Design a protein around this ligand. Sequence first.
Ligand SMILES: CC(C)(C)c1nc2c3ccc(F)cc3c3c(=O)[nH]ccc3c2[nH]1
Length: 285
Amino acid sequence: DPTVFHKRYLKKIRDLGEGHFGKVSLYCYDPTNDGTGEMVAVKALKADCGPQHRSGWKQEIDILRTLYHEHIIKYKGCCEDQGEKSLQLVMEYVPLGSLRDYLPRHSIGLAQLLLFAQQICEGMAYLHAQHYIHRNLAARNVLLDNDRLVKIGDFGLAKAVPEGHEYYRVREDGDSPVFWYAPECLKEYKFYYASDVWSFGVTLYELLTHCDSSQSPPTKFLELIGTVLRLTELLERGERLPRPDKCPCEVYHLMKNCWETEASFRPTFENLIPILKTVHEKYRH
Ligand SMILES: CC(C)(C)c1nc2c3ccc(F)cc3c3c(=O)[nH]ccc3c2[nH]1
């Protein structure tokens, strides 16, 4: 099947990005040894991860392989190292990279930022339809194809939510990222579908600040704090990231709705799509 990539034909060009478990690199898959082969993104378990990360890494691959949607990064296949030196994930190559790296370099208007947001919600609504939570939604983990279509990536923290249940209670977090996480995640280690919607709210905040570092969630939360305990206490008292410069009231309201303290009262991604469509169409012309 076309899902089998032979390592001997993979010609490394450069590195592309670093995720939770893995480093993504650009390769030419070149069976004819001709320079004419297809360009693909290949992700590998980080060199300084031990054997205990292998199960989590395989799960990322297993998850992405079961996903098929226009706003999810496309699984192409795997490459098995003959000689027990691991398994590599092969994906579509999207040269534009992440929203986090794209936004600072380009002047992007509000309507387009809301279109990016809408497309993230469509992909995430699809993800939740498959009974998966992402657990690492941030602008740095959202990629863009050549016509600026959103491709959600780094599924290194993703998990199946047990059937019947609204959340998954995590065992042990290697990395967080705490400034994108809902209170129930920080306190009770519970990750609801609604917890991804919280993270989406922070990602929308990132879009509206154009991923400026001085306005980043860590920078702004550390200013409010004046750390995970104090972050938890900050959010429990109802403090939130401020309204970005030039952000309309109703768009900030959308963000605040995603940050409601009670997980079950936040909008679902399905709810978010029509609202974002409406505000997008409103703010063009
Ligand atoms: C940071 C993260 C692990 C989410 C990631 N960064 C990239 C990336 C960065 C630049 C670039 F030009 C291409 C990519 C890329 C890609 O082309 N395919 C799949 C993932 C991926 C990626 N995945």
